[PDB]
Design an enzyme around this catalytic site. Structure first.
Site, PDB file in Angstrom:
ATOM      1  N   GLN A   1      59.829  -5.261  14.628  1.00  0.00           N
ATOM      2  CA  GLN A   1      60.169  -4.315  15.776  1.00  0.00           C
ATOM      3  C   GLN A   1      59.516  -3.017  16.376  1.00  0.00           C
ATOM      4  O   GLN A   1      59.509  -2.587  17.314  1.00  0.00           O
ATOM      5  CB  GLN A   1      61.799  -3.454  15.684  1.00  0.00           C
ATOM      6  CG  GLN A   1      62.127  -2.374  16.636  1.00  0.00           C
ATOM      7  CD  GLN A   1      62.006  -3.475  17.724  1.00  0.00           C
ATOM      8  OE1 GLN A   1      62.644  -4.762  18.055  1.00  0.00           O
ATOM      9  NE2 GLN A   1      62.302  -2.402  19.552  1.00  0.00           N
ATOM     10  N   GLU A   2      59.008  -1.930  15.581  1.00  0.00           N
ATOM     11  CA  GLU A   2      57.904  -1.096  16.380  1.00  0.00           C
ATOM     12  C   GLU A   2      56.800  -1.368  16.819  1.00  0.00           C
ATOM     13  O   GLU A   2      56.315  -1.150  17.741  1.00  0.00           O
ATOM     14  CB  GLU A   2      57.642   0.262  14.904  1.00  0.00           C
ATOM     15  CG  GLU A   2      59.049   0.557  14.774  1.00  0.00           C
ATOM     16  CD  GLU A   2      59.108   1.750  15.588  1.00  0.00           C
ATOM     17  OE1 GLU A   2      58.781   1.442  16.643  1.00  0.00           O
ATOM     18  OE2 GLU A   2      59.833   2.027  15.951  1.00  0.00           O
ATOM     19  N   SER A   3      55.942  -2.643  15.669  1.00  0.00           N
ATOM     20  CA  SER A   3      54.826  -2.880  16.034  1.00  0.00           C
ATOM     21  C   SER A   3      54.057  -4.957  16.606  1.00  0.00           C
ATOM     22  O   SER A   3      52.702  -4.738  16.846  1.00  0.00           O
ATOM     23  CB  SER A   3      53.622  -2.126  15.941  1.00  0.00           C
ATOM     24  OG  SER A   3      53.421  -3.031  14.207  1.00  0.00           O
TER      25      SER A   3
END
Ligand code: CL
Length: 428
Positions: free
Chosen positions: A283-285
């Site tokens: 989700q982040e990167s």
């Protein structure tokens, strides 16, 4: 003694199903599956415990159901037969699915049933899908297809993905569930009209259990349970989008192997599930360690300097440090949540705080209490989070404006990615 009475007297409802994430799946944390949870709720309705039995294939499943001393019912994403057989009776339908021909990106897409001739095709033995092809073969006698009793849907789709077969045929819902593992799998066309899935009961004139099954499924619809189960297990394409689904599959295959041991190591030393941490990473990167942004977050887990300094991260661009720091941060945040918040909600609250901070999350919880909602229930507090972005609401809060809409998105996605990773199964 009726079928219902046997169940009540024995205090157990025996349900036979398939071994797969879609229906019934065992993981260290517990048991999941659309059918598993639907049957579990039915057992609770009847005041009896659930006992899951599995079949090696569909012929075996129906054979067990009709044997003396067999299970009470089969809950396995079953399509009722084209024509009635005295051995089996089906409940009312509880999910509309469309059979789809599946092909491999890279080869030509068959467009009509006639294009299935001259192809390497495999389907499940004893399936409605095999019967569709049997019916088609009467119209095109040169059609060839193989039926296997040793494979599940996940294996058939794997065979298409790597080029062992040209085509398969599966229900749209299980295609959606599996698209996230197989980057080259694509829908060729919808083969036949949408059909209802139903539970199967033994043959004969006894309707005691059947009528309770049908009353239950009606209640399951009215409460939204069917929609909520449908969305969790079969909603990957709906929520992530089709490109998002097979793109995740490509990343699962190409990116995760570079960081899997880092996630497992952090998970082991932090005593927390590594796949939840990997889900945060995606989700982040999208598992990209060099990922950056103009909002002051950087690296695989997208840490601020604030967070990175507190967690002892000396290089945000290093994948090992980033994974460890963000994982440590998540666990610390979860530990510091008020004691009134119990698992499983506690972990979802922790994801919200990971994204938005505990101060802003506290405002969202206070708002929930004021509205008379449970501040310890995640689905209630989730309703309030978007209000932190609206000046009509945030101006009177202690901490003011926050992107609570983006926080809800973040939590939903991580939970889905966490499910997806939990449900990975190894090749044959
Ligand atoms: Cl959620």
């Amino acid at each position: 003694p009726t079928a219902l009475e046997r169940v009540q007297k024995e205090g157990v409802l025996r349900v036979i199903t398939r071994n797969s994430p879609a229906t019934y799946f065992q993981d260290r944390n517990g048991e999941t599956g659309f059918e598993y949870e639907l049957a579990k709720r039915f057992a609770e309705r009847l005041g009896v415990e659930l006992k899951i039995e599995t079949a090696d294939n569909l012929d075996d499943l129906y054979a067990q159901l009709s044997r003396e001393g067999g299970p009470a019912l089969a809950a396995a994403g079953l399509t009722p037969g084209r024509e009635d057989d005295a051995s089996v009776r089906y409940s009312h339908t509880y999910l509309d699915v469309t059979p789809q021909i599946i092909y491999r990106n890279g080869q030509q897409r068959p467009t009509r049933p006639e294009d299935l001739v001259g192809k390497r095709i495999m389907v499940l033995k004893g399936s409605s899908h095999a019967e569709q092809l049997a019916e088609l073969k009467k119209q095109y006698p040169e059609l060839k297809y193989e039926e296997s009793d040793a494979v599940e849907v996940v294996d058939l789709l794997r065979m298409v993905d790597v080029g062992d077969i040209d085509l398969t045929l599966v229900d749209s819902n299980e295609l959606a569930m599996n698209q996230v593992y197989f980057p080259n799998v694509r829908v060729a066309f919808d083969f036949g009209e949408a059909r209802g899935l139903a539970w199967a009961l033994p043959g004969g004139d006894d309707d005691s259990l059947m009528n309770e099954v049908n009353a239950f499924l009606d209640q399951a619809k009215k409460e939204g349970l069917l929609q909520r189960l449908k969305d969790r297990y079969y909603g990957h394409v709906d929520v992530l989008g089709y490109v998002g689904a097979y793109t995740f599959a490509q990343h699962l295959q190409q990116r995760l192997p570079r960081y899997e041991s880092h996630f497992k190591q952090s998970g082991k030393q932090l005593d927390t599930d590594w796949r939840l941490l990997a889900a945060i990473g995606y989700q982040e990167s999208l598992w990209q360690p060099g990922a950056t942004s103009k909002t002051g977050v950087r690296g695989l887990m997208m840490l601020t300097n604030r967070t990175a300094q507190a967690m002892g991260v000396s290089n945000r661009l290093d994948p090992k440090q980033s994974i460890q720091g963000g994982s440590k941060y998540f666990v610390q945040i979860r530990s510091e949540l008020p004691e009134s918040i119990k698992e499983p909600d506690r972990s979802w609250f922790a994801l919200a705080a990971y994204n938005i901070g505990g101060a802003h999350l506290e405002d969202a919880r206070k708002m929930a209490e004021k509205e008379g909602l449970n501040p310890n229930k995640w689905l209630d507090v989730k309703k309030m989070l978007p209000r932190l972005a609206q000046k009509q609401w945030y101006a009177k809060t202690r901490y003011g404006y926050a992107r609570g809409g983006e926080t809800v998105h973040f939590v939903q996605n991580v939970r889905r990615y966490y499910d997806i990773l939990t449900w990975v199964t190894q090749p044959q």
